[PDB]
Amino acid sequence: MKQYLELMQKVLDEGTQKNDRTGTGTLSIFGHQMRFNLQDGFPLVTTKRCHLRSIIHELLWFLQGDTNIAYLHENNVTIWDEWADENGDLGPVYGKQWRAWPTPDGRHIDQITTVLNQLKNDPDSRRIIVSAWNVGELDKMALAPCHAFFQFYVADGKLSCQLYQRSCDVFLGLPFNIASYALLVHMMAQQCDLEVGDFVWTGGDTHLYSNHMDQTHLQLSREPRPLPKLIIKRKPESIFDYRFEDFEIEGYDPHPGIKAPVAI
Amino acid sequence: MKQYLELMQKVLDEGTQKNDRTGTGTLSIFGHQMRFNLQDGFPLVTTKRCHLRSIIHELLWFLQGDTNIAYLHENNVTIWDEWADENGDLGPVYGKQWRAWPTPDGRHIDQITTVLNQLKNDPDSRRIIVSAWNVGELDKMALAPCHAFFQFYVADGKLSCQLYQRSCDVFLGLPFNIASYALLVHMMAQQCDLEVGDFVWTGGDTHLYSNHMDQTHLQLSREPRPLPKLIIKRKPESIFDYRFEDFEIEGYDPHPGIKAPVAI
Ligand SMILES: CC(C)[C@H](NC(=O)c1ccc(CCc2c[nH]c3nc(N)[nH]c(=O)c23)cc1)C(=O)O
Ligand SMILES: CC(C)[C@H](NC(=O)c1ccc(CCc2c[nH]c3nc(N)[nH]c(=O)c23)cc1)C(=O)O
Ligand SMILES: *c1cc(=O)[nH]c(=O)n1[C@H]1C[C@H](O)[C@@H](COP(=O)(O)O)O1
Ligand SMILES: O=c1ccn([C@H]2C[C@H](O)[C@@H](COP(=O)(O)O)O2)c(=O)[nH]1
């Protein structure tokens, strides 16, 4: 997409070299904002075929409050394998914090239920937020949340959402993360009878790994194509009732996919 | 300052009338980002006179982990009077979360020292984060955190910081908020023998209250002046050791102040 490629180039022109926790190395910039009007189309990268089946199951996995890759495997999604333990657990990551944030006194907060109820009863609220950054449980996570904090907003009947991503692998993770939240917004909007607004992406340490330069240059040579459109074929009775079969992407004509090693 | 004024005119150019919690009504935009190169000078608003004294005391107060206004009163700062209960308490707000975020297994995390140790021992970490958004204690707070989440970043010997402010009163709070974090960045940098980099402000619900319109355009008709300089006269043994007197702002020649009612 225009802004994606735009950021991709910015990291190359401006990035500083950094030794990261993975002894790989990166080119990064700190602080960046991107804006996607969902009305213009679903923001699934077209300059490289992205596979939505993985994106959808992960999100659904999040919403169920699941942190074990078992489910992902049942649907043959392999993206979190390199992080799970011998039992397939990742710890209290995303899912756990979204659906059952543990209070100091032993009980749990269902942030999603809270958000749905806010959008329906108090959309003008400026506190419609979900946070995966649970300071007291970080040490228990296999990896600290990257898309860590997000807020919803309603205006003129449209639902917008801004995500704060503290760490971003521009080549591998970003195309994935963007489509994920765009999807969620579409689901929230349907469940709250609202139109989709903007998806604002804000990043902290935004980087490009050294061993991704070739595929990054290859990707920068391609012309972005018109964005697909998302169709939700069934309207579930709750935001926790969606299933893979309910989503159809239309008009998605991407450039060939690009293979690249992940930093572990 | 240029960035600040440009933000104001932006809310005015594309803000949407919104009703709000206080019943005052706002002109609101969602999603924004601006940068301040601290080396250019201290980002204290010059188009109106600001109370440096109050800003400093509030920050010192936060760093002490305090949440009762008595301290602010000892030093003639009344900016938190409206939300304090009969005993002067605001609940586990900013200070308490910064210095003692309670975990579900009985521990407390001092996020400030944590961050200090990270900048000294692992500055290239992408997890140097302080969060005030403790979803489990939100309901015990007088007011939910506005400047809710911030990240630090080190590049080429310079310390930068990005703040995510989920709700922003552009006329009244923003000037204070920007100066307050730029101050924090200087302190941290002094304690880590680093140079100051950029302060990146990112906003969620960024608004102008309906009853701030006149004063807003009045300010908008003024020319920014040169930015003041921040001078720290002492390097305390710890970041929790600073005193009001250690700070001296030089060259601050602002326009006349402008009074405006705070929505409670
Ligand atoms: C062929 C595909 C499997 C391949 N995609 C990926 O490798 C991948 C892996 C994990 C994630 C989830 C987010 C994530 C978790 N941990 C991570 N670690 C890194 N370095 N980057 C990430 O994005 C993530 C998204 C994408 C592709 O070619 O598109
Ligand atoms: C002369 C000054 C006293 C005046 N400033 C303020 O009144 C003010 C009050 C509280 C805060 C802290 C954040 C805050 C707490 N509660 C809030 N409530 C609202 N509506 N907005 C805010 O910014 C805050 C910052 C600024 C000025 O002219 O600058
Ligand atoms: C909160 C505190 C601060 O440091 N700066 C501010 O700008 N804000 C403002 C935002 C909003 O106008 C009010 C908080 O109310 P709400 O929780 O957003 O309903 O204080
Ligand atoms: O869904 C994800 C998960 C991780 N990251 C990337 C950010 C970093 O490249 C790496 C995480 O490493 P740390 O930031 O924790 O060091 O994974 C993403 O962009 N998206």
Residue boundaries of the structural domains of chain A:
2-264
Angle ∠(B249,B237,A139) on CA atoms, nearest 5: 105
Q: Is B136 within 8 Å of A104 when comparing Cβ atoms?
A: yes
Q: How far apart are CA B26 and CA B206, in angstroms?
A: 9
Length of chain A, in residues = 264
Using the CB atoms, write b or e for A15-54: b if 16+ within 10 Å.
Answer: bbebebeeebebbbbbbbbbbbebeebbbbbbbbebebeb
Residue B45 CB neighbours (<10 A): 21
Element (H, E) at A163: strand A158-169
- Which is it for the CA torsion B177, B181, B182, B187, positive or negative? positive
Closest CA in chain B for residue A145: B127
CA distances in angstroms from B236 to A59, B160, B229, listed in the order given? 47, 21, 20
Helix, strand, or coil here: A250? Answer: strand
Please name the amino acid found at residue B98. Answer: W
> Which H or E element spans position B167?
strand B158-169
Q: Residue A29's beta-bridge partner residues?
A: A206
- Cα separation, A167 vs A136, in Å, equals 19
Beta bridge partners of A156: none
- Asked if B31 lies within 8 A of A31 by C-beta distance, the reply is no
- Which candidate from B31, B101, B167 shows the least CB-CB separation from A135? B101
* Resolution of the experimentally solved model in angstroms: 2.7
Domain spanning A2-264, CATH architecture: 2-Layer Sandwich (3.30)
Phi, psi of A110 (to 5 degrees): -95, 90
Nearest by Cα to A36 from A188, A166, A171, A158: A158
Residue nearest to atom 5 of ligand 3 (CA): B173
- Are the beta carbons of B43 and B227 closer than 8 angstroms? yes
Min Cα distance B108 → chain A (Å) is 8
- The answer to whether B208 is annotated as binding is yes
For the record, the structure tokens of A43 come out as: 């923001």
Residues 6+ apart with CB under 8 A from B181: B147, B150, B161, B163, B199, B201
Q: Judge: A153–B126 Cβ closer than 8 Å, yes or no.
A: no
What kind of experiment solved this structure?
X-ray
Residue among A44, A19, A20, A5 nearest A146 (CA): A20
Name beta bridge partners: A153. Answer: A160
Structure tokens at A66: 């699941």
Q: Which residues of A touch B166 (CB under 8 A)?
A: 126-127, 129, 151
Residues B164 and B152: their CA atoms lie apart, in Å, by 12
- Return d(Cα A64, Cα A245) in angstroms, integer: 16
Cβ proximity of A9 and A186 under 8 Å: no
Helix axes A52-63, A173-191, angle to 10 degrees: 60
CB atoms inside a 10 Å sphere around CB B210: 14
